[PDB]
Amino acid sequence: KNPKSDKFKVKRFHHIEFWCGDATNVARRFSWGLGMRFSAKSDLSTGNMVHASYLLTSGDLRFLFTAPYSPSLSAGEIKPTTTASIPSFDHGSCRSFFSSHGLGVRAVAIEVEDAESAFSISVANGAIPSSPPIVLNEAVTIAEVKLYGDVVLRYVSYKAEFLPGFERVEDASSFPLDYGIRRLDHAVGNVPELGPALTYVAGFTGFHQFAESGLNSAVLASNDEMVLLPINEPVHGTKRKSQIQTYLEHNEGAGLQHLALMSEDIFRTLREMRKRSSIGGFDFMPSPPPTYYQNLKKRVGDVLSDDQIKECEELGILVDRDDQGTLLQIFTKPLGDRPTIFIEIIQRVGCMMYQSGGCGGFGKGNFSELFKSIEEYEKTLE
């Protein structure tokens, strides 16, 4: 059931902003590891004395990396005279966020029809305001409300090129990397209590609920279900410790857990990312045992051929299935020092109408299949 109860007009995921200690080094690592091009900048060379911000793109996926300069460079500015290109930025907020959480996502940005109206409706319906609507060069409007922890949901609306004050990046420093990633599929939060978190977000957006493992979870979705916001809470006192609880402890509370990036060819994406894992890119979780891939034939043998199942095994890809579609997924090890944020690469098969969002689910069924698969241990014991 989709009651289409969005309280304002939501278009698509727009960008994700990481708050960094040094934006240059994180952006360069992510660019090489994920195959994202340098496409825009706002920094000292563009007249920004407040923060350094670098934009990477791959298809419609936009990753923004921002770090503060010395407050001394902008000591004489006030908000009416600021050189910052992102008006919500604050030196103290950014340093406090990073000191408290380490490297991670500050902003989940969605494009809306009217960011001022989205902000107003959201706050009227319970959203805690974070940054009021600011109109940039009479062209772009940006506003922010609190989502969970110190993560904000950022609204952006365009009258008619990322943000004013950003410059397109010099061709020489913009190598056209591309490993196949095309857009953000979903963005997932970890919280101590799922119930109140869902009630708060669903309350102010009108997003509806989208149709033993250490977690309980639920997914909020926009009218066309292309903006997907799962939220997890821990399940305490199990056999092994909950990964959600470990996250909360190492992150100092709620925050963004993972970003799921849709690829238009997950085989190529994973080949390219895995070649770079040990030369500056990203590491992947340990692959499932061969029994997992033998079990794939019975589960998805009508969707994937033997060779494609063999290719999944070569690359460590997980496979799950809905009553409507199929999901190919894999998870990176944490992106930084702390066992907190990580990335999921995904590709979805089915639900052709365009492909409907969330086709195939989120891989909940792979918790059971992975554990059952560990029966490779019992088979090796023989």
Ligand X SMILES: Cc1c(C(=O)C2=C(O)CCCC2=O)ccc2c1c(=O)n(CC#C[Si](C)(C)C)c(=O)n2C
Residues 1-40 that bind ligand X (CB under 6 A): none
Please state whether beta strands 151-158 and 104-112 pair in parallel, antiparallel, or not at all (unpaired): parallel
Residue 370 engages ligand X in binding (rule: CB under 6 A): yes
The binder of 338, among a second copy, Co ion, ligand X, none, by C-beta within 5 to 8 A per type, is: a second copy
Residue 362 engages ligand X in binding (rule: CB under 6 A): yes
Kindly state the smallest distance separating residue 158's Cβ from Co ion, in Å.
Answer: 28
Residues 240-299 that bind Co ion (CB under 5 A): 260
d(CA 71, CA 363) in angstroms, rounded, equals 45
Cβ count within 10 A of residue 302: 10
Q: Does 116 belong to an annotated binding site? A: no
Pick the closer one to ligand X by CB: 53 or 251. Answer: 251
* Four-residue CA torsion sign, 146, 105, 141, 70: positive
Which residue from 53, 74, 157, 366 is in contact with ligand X, where contact means CB under 6 A? 366
Burial class (CB in 10 A: 0-12, 13-18, 19+), 67: buried
Kindly state the smallest distance separating residue 230's Cβ from ligand X, in Å.
Answer: 4
Query: What is the chain's percent helix, strand, coil content, to nearest 5?
Result: 30, 35, 35
Residues 226-265 that bind ligand X (CB under 6 A): 230, 232, 243, 258, 260
* Four-residue CA torsion sign, 238, 243, 249, 252: negative
The binder of 217, among ligand X, a second copy, Co ion, none, by C-beta within 5 to 8 A per type, is: ligand X
Contact at 8 Å (CB) between 227 and 201?
A: no
Q: Does 258 belong to an annotated binding site? A: yes
Tokens of residue 52, six digits: 């350094």
Residue 344 engages Co ion in binding (rule: CB under 5 A): yes
Q: Does 344 belong to an annotated binding site? A: yes
Interface residues with a second copy (CB under 8 A)?
A: 20-26, 28-33, 38, 43-44, 52, 67, 69-70, 72-73, 95, 98-100, 102-103, 172-175, 177, 249-252, 277-281, 283, 335-339
Report how far Cα 201 is from the mean position of its chain's Cα atoms.
17
- The binding site consists of 186, 258, 344
- The binding site for Fe cation consists of 186, 258, 344
